């Protein structure tokens, strides 16, 4: 509620920040003393240089030694940079850990491509403050406190004026700080929009070559930068405005000194007064960057309070395998326009069961919440007549492989694209078997040295036929007791399909499998078939039973068979 | 070659920097002069100010307004910073335009996730050079020359001590910049690496949920951060080193005062030489930062030197329409290894043709080739016995729709996902007409306000089945000369494809259509069925003729025939 307390609270979280900063400033503290004492002794010392020949060698040696300790100020600067280059490091560390552990429902709203720049750019702004200006603040406060002390006429007898410089200046600065804080909160919250705009586009250049997108996309980029970032000059305008105003209040000090004038002391008093300008320049800049840095962090703190969906809180049960049943459970991908309708069905183990649905139904999310991304609102999910949430929050997941409507990959090689599931016992001799069981070997060995082979960003180097096949190798290698194929027909030929169907049947006899297929033909043989329509289910039983006994559609399957019926008369 | 001329050349291509910068420096010039003359007047003004306040007030108020005019130097800093804010915006502008128009080939060998950061974090460093220290480089250079010229006996009779202060310091700085320059190319090429890692991790979070990746992939971020950027402190090490080294060179001049000046005012000499300290330090920092900026921009320049392939240099607009022909085509995705073998086929116009093949064949590469993304090394691609290359590079694309094997979508409103075909005259009246021929509105109008609804990053908000249709609308809206359905059955049901196929038949009757579809049942009735395999073509003609006449498979169709025949029994 103060725009200040959370900041110093957040930097405190990086524990090693206490190690050297106080030591760093203290080294700079003595640097201030020698600087504030050198000019008052050189005039006396040069008077002692009336001969400057025999003693000059010793003082020259002394000056040699002393000016090395003048160079010692850099060691404070190096340390000050060092501790700063740590407080940024842990800040990235602590954020990045928190940026994955939070529920996927958060990412379905906040445009992940935008929030990436809140790791790089929304911390680099702190760097300029933490290193240089802080030294200015320390070197200034000691200088100003070391200024009025010699003003003994001014700090014990003529004090009515030293106390008027700060309240006026700060009163002037407060609007400036508030304005600039309203700037930094934007310049960061548009960098994220800008850097986000690219990764939503640039990795997809294949489409943006639509023969006119390049014109339009170039338009969006420019309107992103020029109309916003160059208009960030608004920060520059207020940043330069401080000079006059910080000189203005100081001017008022001077009208006060001439209005309360005795004669033999004021002459030196004016000279002493003309020393505090440079400290005032540094101190005013510190607060300017201070409330600047906050706006570069105001967005960051909020993503440090989202509720960490994953826990290790698996109470006492992880392993005993029992069927999975959903009891009157309904879910909303949006908290009001619920898209599902109190599904109730049972998944008997040891027997594969298939969901088939027309495009627009509730197939995908029924997987996406059966892996407990969402914890649906109405109803619940059980296995073994026990609540699933009592098993774990995501330690349950490792017993379950998964592929998506798509087949995503990551920029590593084809090796560490399959490994990180078990991530301890890769068992190089077994990566082969999983690729075999996904029919991946026989069209990989021809590639240049599988381990050496490299995908593009989204797996452009591999292809659609190869992309889907390599994805399920992740699921079959993880050795699960619960499996989800998601598109056995996405991008792969019938040649691939028969081998895959002939392969995973050999493993998954006592390990329950739930698969959804684009075409009804691939999973007719399964021991149970659901038929999801717009969040409801209006069919059960085996497909052969479903045809004759049940008659809601009676033609969804027949909408497939008349497609293939042309293949008999025209062929023989 | 010299690694400094291109920088002033790279800045040069952004024109407007030269406009107001001279006025900015000129203000800094008079800023230096007034700072040069301020101490001389005050030490004698106080003698005049020694008079009572009756005369002091009349002069003090004039000194006050002088101070406000001394405050005018602030608006000089704004001028530099604005000029700086102009040059950084220009660098982003030029870089962004060159980034789009390069051949797609570069965006595969390189990584898009890497190059994104080179527009945000690889120009911001140039700000800190161009804002403050550029003034220091000017303030120092005038002050040092002015201060040296004050030594009017030392510059014409005892010049030995002025030829050592600067050149010896420069000799010391030579390794410092060289070490610093090597740092910037490393730190910037790793910030690029770090930002590259994240944009290919977060968007696919649903698969980093492998129940152990949250521990492992988090480690990759740390190992990227901690072992590199907390070790990026290594430049802060040498950046401190300027202090001690500028010390020895100048004290070496301090001992030179007795090395040659001990035989000859002298006290005024010592006073003045203790004033060149801050200017020399200020100007020294500028060179150090310069070698820092040059490194963070030496990788920057290189991607301004690619072929910027797309042009309008094709002196044709494609008014006519003739069939597509492939003449002895052989393409390789790498100049050494090739996946296409002398393929020869004629795409008959105005009547649908198809390509069917197995996984990992040459199907979709032949699409990217026929869109002329790559211009194959061997053979040629022509239409009507005229090469495609003479026509244009990407005005031809405007006549050909293209839906990909995956279902791509930019982020925005699903309206805006289809709008930019004509990019000017969206003509709201018949967007639904494109959707109806794509079977979309029956599963769109029920949603909240077709325009209002917005997809996520890769269409996460809509479904995969929905996305593949919503992409195919972009194909039909362009009303193209050539239609390219790449995945007609990827993610969509039987209730879709029947309504889909029945729609395109009316639309394209004299407009040729190239389609590749799995599950051969869906392309049985096309005029020409082509078989591709490992970069070679081994089939022609109608499906019924190719069935028994050719003898390669005789069972590839039977592949699904026996797979689908089980439903009846
Ligand atoms: C309180 C009112 N008194 C003054 C306030 C001043 O404010 C200044 C603010 C500045 N901006 C800071 C961001 C800079 C750069 C120089 C300033 C000077 C200045 C300007 C030109 C030449 C020399 C000096 C100077 O400081 O030397 C005086 C001997 C300055 C001088 C006086 C007397
Ligand atoms: C060549 C060796 N001789 C010197 C080198 C120096 O290097 C300095 C480098 C600096 N870094 C630049 C980025 C800064 C900030 C101050 C420096 C001072 C300095 C430090 C504290 C107080 C006053 C001064 C100072 O300069 O005033 C001397 C009267 C300094 C002084 C001397 C004598
Ligand atoms: N943000 C959202 N996330 C998931 N589903 C959504 C969202 N918004 C709406 N939906 C609805 O939820 C359904 C989820 O799609 P689903 O996972 O079933 O796709 P699918 O399994 O590939 O099948 P389809 O062929 O219908 O795409 C869609 O039909 C869609 O209408
Ligand atoms: N970036 C790439 N571009 C082209 N080919 C690649 C690339 N990376 C790898 N390849 C290799 O080139 C071959 C051709 O793949 P292609 O993209 O033609 O498959 P496809 O036509 O998508 O197959 P399917 O249609 O069955 O998915 C692949 O077997 C693959 O091994
Ligand atoms: Mg799904
Ligand atoms: Mg393909």
């Amino acid at each position: 509620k103060s725009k200040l307390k959370p900041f110093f609270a957040l930097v405190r979280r990086t524990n090693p920040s206490y190690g050297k900063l106080a030591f760093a400033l203290a080294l700079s503290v003595v640097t201030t003393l020698v600087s504030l004492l050198i000019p008052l002794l050189t005039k006396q010392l040069v008077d002692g240089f009336s001969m400057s020949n025999l003693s000059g060698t010793q003082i020259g040696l002394i000056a040699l030694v002393f000016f090395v300790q003048a160079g010692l100020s850099a060691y404070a600067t190096y340390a000050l940079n060092y501790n700063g280059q740590k407080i940024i490091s842990g800040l990235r560390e602590l954020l990045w850990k928190k940026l994955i552990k939070l529920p996927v429902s958060y990412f379905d709203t906040n445009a992940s491509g935008e929030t990436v720049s809140r790791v790089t750019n929304d911390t680099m702004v702190v760097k300029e403050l933490i290193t240089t200006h802080i030294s200015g603040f320390i070197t200034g406060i000691i200088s100003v406190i070391g200024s009025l002390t010699i003003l003994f006429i001014m700090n014990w007898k003529l004090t009515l004026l030293v106390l008027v410089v700060v309240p006026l200046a700060a009163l002037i600065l407060v609007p400036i700080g508030r304005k600039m804080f309203s700037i930094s909160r934007e310049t960061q919250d548009e960098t994220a929009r800008f850097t986000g705009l690219l990764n939503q586009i640039l990795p997809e250049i294949r489409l943006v070559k639509a023969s006119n997108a390049e014109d339009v996309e170039y338009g969006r980029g420019k309107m992103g930068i020029s109309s916003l970032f160059k208009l960030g000059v608004r920060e520059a305008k207020v940043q330069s405005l401080v000079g006059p105003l910080i000189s203005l209040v100081l001017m008022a000090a001077l009208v006060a000194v001439i209005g309360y004038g005795t004669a033999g002391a004021l002459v030196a008093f004016i000279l002493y007064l003309f020393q505090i300008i440079m400290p005032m320049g540094q101190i005013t800049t510190f607060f300017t960057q201070l409330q600047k840095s906050i706006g570069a962090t105001e967005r960051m703190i909020e993503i440090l309070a989202e509720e960490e969906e994953d826990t290790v809180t698996g109470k006492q049960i992880e392993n005993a395998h029992l069927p999975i049943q959903l009891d009157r459970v309904s879910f909303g991908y949006k908290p009001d326009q619920l898209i599902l309708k109190e599904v109730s069905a049972v998944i008997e183990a040891g027997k594969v069961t298939a969901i088939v649905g027309p495009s627009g139904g509730g197939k995908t999310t029924l997987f996406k919440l059966l892996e407990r991304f969402y914890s649906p609102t109405a109803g619940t999910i059980r296995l073994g007549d026990e609540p699933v949430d009592t098993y774990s929050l995501e330690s349950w997941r490792e017993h379950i492989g998964y592929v998506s409507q798509e087949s995503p990959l990551m920029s590593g090689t084809i090796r560490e694209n399959i490994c990180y599931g078990l991530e301890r016992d890769v068992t190089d001799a077994e990566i082969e078997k999983a690729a075999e069981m996904a029919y991946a070997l026989n069209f990989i060995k021809e590639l240049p040295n599988q381990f050496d082979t490299e995908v593009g960003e989204r797996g452009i180097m591999l292809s659609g036929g190869q992309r889907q096949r390599i994805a399920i190798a992740r699921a079959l290698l993880r050795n699960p007791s619960i499996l989800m194929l998601d598109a056995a027909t996405s991008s792969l030929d019938s040649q691939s399909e028969k081998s895959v169907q002939q392969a995973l049947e050999v493993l998954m006899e006592g390990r329950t499998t739930i698969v959804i297929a684009h075409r009804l033909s691939t999973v007719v043989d399964a021991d149970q078939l659901l038929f999801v329509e717009k969040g409801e289910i209006t069919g059960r039983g085996t497909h052969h039973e479903l045809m004759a006994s049940h008659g809601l559609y009676r033609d969804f399957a027949e909408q497939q068979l008349k497609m293939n019926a042309d293949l008999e008369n025209k062929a023989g």
Side-chain angles (χ1 to χ4, degrees), chain A:
Chain A
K1 211 253 179 183
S2 87
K3 309 289 179 158
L4 183 63
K5 184 142 271 193
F7 178 81
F8 264 66
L10 171 150
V11 297
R12 175 181 141 200
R13 282 195 191 176
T14 297
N15 189 359
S17 301
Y18 264 121
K20 194 170 299 164
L21 202 173
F23 203 105
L25 59 93
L27 302 189
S28 71
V29 163
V30 304
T31 302
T32 61
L33 273 296
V34 287
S35 48
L36 292 179
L37 290 182
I38 180 68
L40 273 75
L41 60 91
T42 51
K43 180 254 167 175
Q44 310 195 32
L45 202 62
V46 72
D47 278 339
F49 280 155
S50 313
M51 61 79 71
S52 175
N53 283 333
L54 277 178
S55 177
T57 46
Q58 273 54 68
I59 303 295
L61 288 170
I62 276 176
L64 283 168
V65 173
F66 283 180
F67 290 164
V68 170
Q69 279 79 72
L72 171 143
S73 66
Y75 180 85
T77 310
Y78 158 85
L80 183 62
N81 271 312
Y82 184 60
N83 205 0
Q85 278 273 44
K86 197 165 199 178
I87 191 167
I88 190 167
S89 179
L91 182 47
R92 297 181 186 185
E93 180 76 21
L94 191 141
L95 194 149
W96 170 254
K97 206 187 84 171
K98 190 66 67 176
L99 194 54
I100 62 170
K101 281 189 176 177
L102 73 165
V104 298
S105 182
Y106 177 89
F107 281 180
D108 287 358
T109 296
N110 271 15
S112 167
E114 163 200 323
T115 187
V116 59
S117 167
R118 300 207 172 284
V119 174
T120 78
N121 293 44
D122 280 339
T123 60
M124 211 155 278
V125 179
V126 176
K127 184 183 79 171
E128 271 146 30
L129 182 140
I130 193 66
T131 72
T132 61
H133 297 91
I134 282 177
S135 76
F137 182 76
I138 310 294
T139 60
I141 53 174
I142 186 156
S143 62
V144 64
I145 201 59
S147 62
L148 75 164
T149 178
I150 202 63
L151 277 296
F152 64 92
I153 305 99
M154 187 66 204
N155 58 29
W156 186 39
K157 312 276 276 180
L158 277 71
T159 68
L160 268 181
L161 283 71
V162 61
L163 196 46
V164 310
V165 65
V166 289
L168 277 297
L171 183 63
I172 297 301
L173 295 178
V174 167
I176 292 315
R178 259 35 177 182
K179 191 70 57 59
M180 191 143 46
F181 182 71
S182 175
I183 301 299
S184 173
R185 181 142 66 75
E186 286 283 325
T187 187
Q188 298 315 89
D189 200 0
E190 202 66 340
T191 45
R193 186 69 44 73
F194 172 56
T195 297
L197 181 63
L198 302 194
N199 282 111
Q200 293 163 317
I201 301 299
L202 201 68
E204 290 272 282
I205 188 169
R206 317 201 170 290
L207 186 151
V208 77
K209 279 297 181 169
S211 77
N212 295 295
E214 47 178 353
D215 281 327
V216 164
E217 210 75 34
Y218 182 36
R220 195 147 68 165
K222 194 172 60 44
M223 181 195 328
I225 47 177
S226 178
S227 58
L228 277 296
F229 276 47
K230 185 181 182 295
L231 277 72
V233 65
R234 177 157 58 177
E235 194 265 2
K237 194 165 292 296
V238 76
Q239 213 290 320
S240 174
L241 188 149
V242 63
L245 277 296
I246 196 56
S247 66
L248 189 62
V249 274
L250 189 147
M251 156 262 183
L254 195 144
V255 71
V257 311
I258 73 174
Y260 284 91
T262 309
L266 61 83
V267 298
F269 151 73
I270 302 295
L271 265 293
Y272 286 119
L273 173 62
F274 291 166
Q275 184 177 2
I276 66 172
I277 299 99
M278 172 285 317
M280 271 315 188
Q282 293 324 81
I283 190 167
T284 192
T285 52
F286 181 71
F287 285 165
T288 63
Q289 305 299 298
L290 174 56
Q291 289 185 358
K292 165 179 184 164
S293 179
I294 302 299
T297 300
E298 210 289 325
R299 184 49 198 206
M300 182 179 72
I301 300 173
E302 309 282 337
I303 75 169
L304 277 296
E306 295 277 24
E307 295 179 354
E308 291 76 13
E309 66 96 19
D310 165 45
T311 67
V312 176
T313 59
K315 285 295 183 179
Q316 89 286 14
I317 61 171
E318 299 180 357
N319 55 29
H321 181 74
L322 276 300
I324 303 101
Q325 74 89 0
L326 304 100
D327 182 77
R328 288 303 199 96
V329 61
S330 73
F331 164 73
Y333 182 76
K334 183 78 182 64
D336 189 57
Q337 52 153 300
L338 283 72
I339 176 60
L340 191 62
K341 294 297 173 285
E342 52 187 1
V343 61
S344 289
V346 287
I347 307 300
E348 301 95 299
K351 304 159 73 170
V352 298
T353 187
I355 302 99
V356 295
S359 76
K363 290 183 280 194
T364 292
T365 68
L366 191 151
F367 285 10
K368 209 187 297 290
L369 65 87
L370 190 148
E371 300 323 320
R372 300 183 70 254
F373 290 16
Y374 283 133
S375 69
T377 69
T380 179
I381 286 181
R382 264 71 71 80
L383 75 163
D385 202 31
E386 294 294 328
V388 296
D389 56 339
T390 51
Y391 273 90
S392 78
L393 267 168
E394 279 286 320
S395 293
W396 185 60
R397 206 263 202 192
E398 193 266 2
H399 273 314
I400 288 172
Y402 176 72
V403 310
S404 174
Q405 293 293 106
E406 60 278 46
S407 286
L409 281 70
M410 295 184 287
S411 160
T413 61
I414 206 169
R415 187 69 171 88
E416 71 275 20
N417 193 11
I418 311 171
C419 292
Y420 52 66
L422 264 175
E423 63 86 33
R424 292 170 295 173
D425 60 357
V426 57
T427 52
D428 196 309
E430 202 198 353
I431 311 294
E432 181 65 26
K433 186 77 42 196
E436 170 47 61
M437 221 175 298
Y439 200 81
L441 182 63
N442 269 337
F443 293 99
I444 282 170
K445 202 55 67 163
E446 278 73 359
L447 276 168
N449 202 0
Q450 180 182 3
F451 177 81
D452 174 74
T453 61
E454 268 200 1
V455 306
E457 192 178 284
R458 270 146 166 113
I460 302 300
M461 271 305 208
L462 293 174
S463 164
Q466 286 267 39
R467 205 179 317 128
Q468 168 90 352
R469 289 194 287 192
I470 199 67
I472 76 161
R474 184 179 296 111
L476 289 198
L477 178 140
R478 195 176 313 247
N479 201 26
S481 89
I482 296 176
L483 182 59
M484 282 76 77
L485 264 66
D486 193 14
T489 81
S490 161
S491 69
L492 73 164
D493 53 22
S494 65
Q495 182 97 333
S496 43
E497 200 162 60
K498 65 182 181 293
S499 179
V500 168
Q501 194 195 345
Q502 214 74 20
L504 63 95
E505 211 57 10
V506 167
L507 291 177
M508 302 321 176
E509 294 102 349
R511 274 70 59 210
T512 176
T513 295
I514 47 182
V515 57
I516 62 100
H518 291 299
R519 295 301 156 94
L520 205 139
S521 176
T522 189
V523 70
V524 38
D525 302 346
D527 293 14
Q528 197 160 169
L529 194 145
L530 305 177
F531 194 47
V532 286
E533 293 179 353
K534 305 194 301 310
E536 314 198 15
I537 297 89
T538 184
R540 298 292 297 272
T542 308
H543 158 267
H544 186 273
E545 183 178 1
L546 196 48
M547 311 285 328
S549 58
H550 202 281
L552 179 137
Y553 63 97
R554 192 55 68 84
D555 52 17
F556 192 96
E558 195 69 29
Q559 205 168 12
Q560 301 310 352
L561 312 189
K562 76 159 52 187
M563 311 275 148
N564 302 114
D566 53 5
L567 292 165
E568 281 93 357
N569 53 1
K570 211 163 191 294

